[PDB]
């Protein structure tokens, strides 16, 4: 997270960390949408062009974390995947369209003060919160800078980082990339004349872009950290997966009934 802040403890109880077994390393961010399901970006598990293709046994899921590196024995919970689901039409070849993916935990997790699920939006909610100008929040343990002087510092944060960015008008988004953006994406960030900065960055992928409803006081996950051209560049914005549109697929996969 570029230009973010240390999050307060228990500020994003739905924040999940995607941990790789060997080598041990932080793969991506993710979110807990329930007792056994985790929502993340597809590109975190599969991106052929870089020979990226994780399977259920290569990863671990760590829920309830604050610190990036510590093993929070009393608070966090480590889970194993039972099955991974990637959107059938995830376009890793040209624009990362439908960059979404669900992961099914082996055993349900016990909610706590540190572990709590985020909500998925419904038609009206999406309709009224997803408006240009409105602010969303992004969280993660990714890079603090797009680039930095080697060995002179630490590109990564110690604790979970948080940033609040505004939603940008589609047209403004479209004119900022040579990429073919779809209706399954959205962009956020401040504009050059806005006076503020902020962005997600490598390591933040899969993380949730949430929004709070003033009428019910609940947090809704409206987007997923997807892709971006650098980090915190002027005249550039971050692209998020449009959770609401891909909701039927989620629905279809989950099978709560």
């Amino acid at each position: 997270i570029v230009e973010g802040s240390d999050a307060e403890i228990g500020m994003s109880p739905w924040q999940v960390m995607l941990f790789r077994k060997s080598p041990q390393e932080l793969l991506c961010g993710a979110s807990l949408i329930s007792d056994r399901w985790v929502l993340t970006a597809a590109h975190c598990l599969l991106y052929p062009p870089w020979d990226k293709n994780f399977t259920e046994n290569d990863l671990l899921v760590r829920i309830g974390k604050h610190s990036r590196t510590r093993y929070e024995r009393n608070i966090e919970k480590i889970s194993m995947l039972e099955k991974i689901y990637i959107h059938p039409r995830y376009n890793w070849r040209e624009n990362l369209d439908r960059d979404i993916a669900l992961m099914k935990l082996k055993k349900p997790v016990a909610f706590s003060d540190y572990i709590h699920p985020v909500c998925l939006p419904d038609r009206e909610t999406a309709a009224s919160l997803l408006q240009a100008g409105y602010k969303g929040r992004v969280t993660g343990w990714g890079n603090l800078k797009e680039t930095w002087t080697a060995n002179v510092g630490k590109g990564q944060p110690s604790v979970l980082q948080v940033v609040n960015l505004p939603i940008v008008e589609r047209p403004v988004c479209k004119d900022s990339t040579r990429i073919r953006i779809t209706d399954n994406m959205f962009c956020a960030g401040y504009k050059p004349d806005e006076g503020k900065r902020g962005d997600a960055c490598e390591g933040d992928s899969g993380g949730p872009f949430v929004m709070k409803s003033p009428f019910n006081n609940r947090w809704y996950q409206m987007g997923i950290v997807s892709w971006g051209e650098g980090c915190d560049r002027d005249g550039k914005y971050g692209f998020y997966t449009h959770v609401f549109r891909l909701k039927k697929w989620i629905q279809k996969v989950i099978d709560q009934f």
Binding site: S5, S112, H116, C119, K135, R137, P166, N217, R218, W219
Partner: peptide
Amino acid sequence: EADCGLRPLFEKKSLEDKTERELLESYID
């Protein structure tokens, strides 16, 4: 049905986080 979106140490404790208002105000602009 299942509760979600209500942070156990915040909403449920009637407390708010440090930059939450920046979110809320952005609505009533």
